[PDB]
Design a protein around this ligand. Structure first.
Ligand SMILES: OC[C@H]1O[C@@H](O[C@H]2[C@H](O)[C@H](O)[C@H](O[C@H]3[C@H](O)[C@H](O)[C@H](O)O[C@@H]3CO)O[C@@H]2CO)[C@@H](O)[C@@H](O)[C@@H]1O
Length: 309
C-alpha cells in the first residue's frame, strides 16, 4: 500500500449538491491547496434513533446516484483516486457508535438481524456504485463501537460487499478502538479515526503498532484532523467543543501529527477531516472555527507534508 495522501469530501452534501459548479470548484481547490491524491467521499444515510432498524438512503439528505457517479468521475478526471465511505447518522442526533440492540431477540423488540439486513442492503447499493466507478477502496462502516462485537454479522456484510465490489475493503474504527475489532482478517486494510491528543501520540502510536503487527494488513488513519478552536488539540474529535477560534492551534496539531507519524513506517496515510462541498469564502477563513483548512495556516502544513511524501 502506497502512502495515502487523502482528504475527506462531501460530508455536508445534500441531494443536488454534487450537480453544481460550486461542488466541482471546491474539489479542485481541495486538490490544489492540499496536494491530496485521494478523496474520501463520506456520505451518511439516516435512521430514526440508535435503536431503530431502517436505514434511509433516498431522502433529501442523500445525493442521488447519478450525481454521485458524476462527482466520482469528475474526481477521476482530476487524477484523484476515490475512497467511498457510506455510513449512517441518527435523526435524533445520537452518535452512530451507540447503535445497539439487545443481545437476544425479544418479541416485538428491534433485533441485530433486522438492523444488519437494512444496513447490508444499504452498503450493497453503494458497493455496486464503487464497482461501476472503479473506486480504489470501500469503507463498510465508521465508528460503530457498540456494533463491533457482532463479528459474525460484520463478516456476513463484508462477504456481501465482496460479491458486488472487487476493490479494497476496510472498516474504520473509532479512536482507541483499534483492538476492539475481531474481523480485521476479513478486510484488506485496517483503519481508524486517529483523533488523538497533541500530547499523547507516542503512547497511542505504540499501542496501535502492537495491534497492527498482529495482522498482515496495511493501516491508515481514514479520518484525522482538528478544528481551529482553543482546546481542540487535546480533543480533536469533538466538533462541538466549547472554545474560542484559534487557527494556529489547528496548524500546530497538524504539524505535531505529521512529525510523530512520519517515523512509523506502518502509518500508511490519512483521510483528513474534512473539506466542505459548499466551501466557505476564503475571506471568511480567519473567522471559521471548524475542521476546514482552506485559507488557514494548517493548509500550508498539509500541502508541504503531502508534497514531501
Ligand atoms: O453540519 C450540520 C449537520 O451536522 C451534524 O453533525 C455532524 C457534525 O457537525 C460533524 O460534521 C461530525 O463529524 C464527525 C463525524 O460524524 C465522524 O465521527 C468523523 O470521524 O469525525 C467528524 C468530526 O468529529 O458529524 C456529525 C454528524 O454525524 C448534525 O448536527 C446535523 O443535525 C447537522 O445539519
Amino acid at each position: 500500500m502506497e502512502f495515502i495522501k487523502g482528504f475527506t469530501f462531501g460530508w455536508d452534501s445534500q441531494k443536488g449538491y454534487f450537480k453544481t459548479e460550486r461542488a466541482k470548484e471546491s474539489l479542485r481547490l481541495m486538490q490544489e491547496r492540499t496536494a491530496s491524491e485521494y478523496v474520501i467521499v463520506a456520505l451518511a444515510a439516516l435512521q430514526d434513533t440508535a435503536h431503530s432498524t431502517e436505514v434511509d438512503f433516498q431522502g433529501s439528505h442523500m445525493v442521488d446516484d447519478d450525481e454521485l457517479i458524476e462527482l466520482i468521475d469528475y474526481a477521476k478526471s482530476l487524477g484523484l483516486k476515490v475512497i467511498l465511505k457510506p455510513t449512517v447518522n441518527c435523526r435524533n442526533g445520537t452518535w452512530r457508535a451507540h447503535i445497539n440492540f439487545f443481545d437476544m431477540d425479544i418479541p416485538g423488540e428491534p433485533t441485530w438481524d433486522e438492523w444488519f439486513e437494512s444496513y447490508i442492503n444499504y452498503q450493497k447499493h453503494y458497493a455496486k456504485i464503487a464497482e461501476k466507478t472503479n473506486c480504489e477502496m470501500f469503507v463498510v462502516g465508521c465508528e460503530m463501537v457498540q456494533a463491533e462485537r457482532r463479528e459474525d454479522k460484520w463478516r456476513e456484510l463484508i462477504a456481501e460487499v465482496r460479491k458486488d465490489y472487487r476493490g479494497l475493503v476496510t472498516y474504520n474504527t473509532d479512536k482507541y478502538q483499534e483492538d476492539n475489532v475481531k474481523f480485521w482478517d476479513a478486510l484488506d486494510v485496517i483503519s481508524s479515526s486517529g483523533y488523538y491528543p497533541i500530547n499523547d501520540w507516542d503512547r497511542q502510536l505504540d499501542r496501535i503498532e502492537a495491534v497492527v503487527k498482529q495482522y498482515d494488513k496495511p493501516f491508515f488513519f481514514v479520518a484525522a484532523g482538528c478544528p481551529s478552536r482553543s482546546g481542540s488539540a487535546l480533543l480533536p474529535n469533538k466538533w462541538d467543543l466549547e472554545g474560542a477560534i484559534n487557527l494556529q492551534e489547528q496548524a500546530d496539531y497538524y504539524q505535531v501529527m505529521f512529525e510523530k507519524t512520519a517515523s512509523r513506517s506502518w502509518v500508511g496515510g490519512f483521510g483528513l477531516w474534512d473539506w466542505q462541498t459548499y466551501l466557505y469564502d476564503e475571506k471568511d477563513a480567519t473567522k471559521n472555527d471548524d475542521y476546514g483548512v482552506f485559507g488557514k495556516p494548517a493548509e500550508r502544513v498539509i500541502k508541504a507534508y503531502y508534497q514531501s511524501r
